[PDB]
Amino acid sequence: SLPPAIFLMGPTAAGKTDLAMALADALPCELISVDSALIYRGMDIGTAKPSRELLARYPHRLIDIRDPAESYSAAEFRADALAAMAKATARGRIPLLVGGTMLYYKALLEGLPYTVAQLAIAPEQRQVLHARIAQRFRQMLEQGFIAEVEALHARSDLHAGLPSIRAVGYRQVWDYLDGKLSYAEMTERGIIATRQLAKRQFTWLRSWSHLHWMDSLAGDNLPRALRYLKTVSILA
């Protein structure tokens, strides 16, 4: 009789964090981030990290747990997630792992003493996701993405080749700061990189079994999700 757990994956910008918070208000959950970039402190705007205020009312595990000068392996995620899941479970809370880093989920499922319900969200038309990706990136620039990266760029202990700087978009802003690119080239290439990420995520997901999809444009995802729980043998 393995305790319950929820997986909420999908491409970047699909609306995973949004739905997770919604679900966090419907059931006793423990939000656990599954994102290789959100682990880094000081990388909030460019990574679409939930605001300080939102995190206060929707605490996430595995967020701001590492300095940008540090590395983080899928193996460390593995141990960290298992720890967070056991801790949440002992409290009666349902582990809700939400994120788009597929290698992490993979590491957990393979390398799980839980009855896992797997959800995935994305638009039916990929063109819709691309438009959002482009617009969200432009918003990041307005919210201070460049100044955010300037602070990293100014650290002598950081360089463009580090795992943290590989977070999509950061390398482009970094090169801009090095004066290698124009503002336009930085924007376009940053959007391309993110679109490339979404493509890699769809490839992981398309061959992913036991997934219950949902539409990013749907407005009744909350009730739709709460209903699936029973299907995979889970009494909520």
Binding-site residue numbers for ATP are: 10-17
Contacts of 92 (CB under 8 A, 6+ apart): 28
Q: CB of residue 8 vs Mg ion: minimum separation in angstroms?
A: 10
Residues from 7 through 46 that contact Mg ion (CB under 5 A): 17
Q: CB of residue 48 vs Mg ion: minimum separation in angstroms?
A: 6
Q: Which of 16, 13, 27 is nearest to 213 (CA)?
A: 16
- Contact between 31 and 20 under an 8 Å Cβ cutoff? The reply is yes
Contacts of 22 (CB under 8 A, 6+ apart): 221, 222
- Total residues belonging to the chain: 236
Nearer to Mg ion, 17 or 187 (CB): 17
Nearest-CB residue for Mg ion: 17
Q: Which of 35, 111, 42 is nearest to 79 (CA)?
A: 111
Nearer to Mg ion, 17 or 194 (CB): 17
Does the protein bind Mg ion through residue 89 (CB under 5 A)?
A: no
Q: CB of residue 52 vs Mg ion: minimum separation in angstroms?
A: 15
Q: How far apart are CA 6 and CA 97, in angstroms?
A: 6
Q: CB of residue 184 vs Mg ion: minimum separation in angstroms?
A: 27
What token pair was written down for 39? Answer: 């682990």
Nearer to Mg ion, 17 or 201 (CB): 17
Write out the residues near Mg ion by the rule CB under 5 A: 17
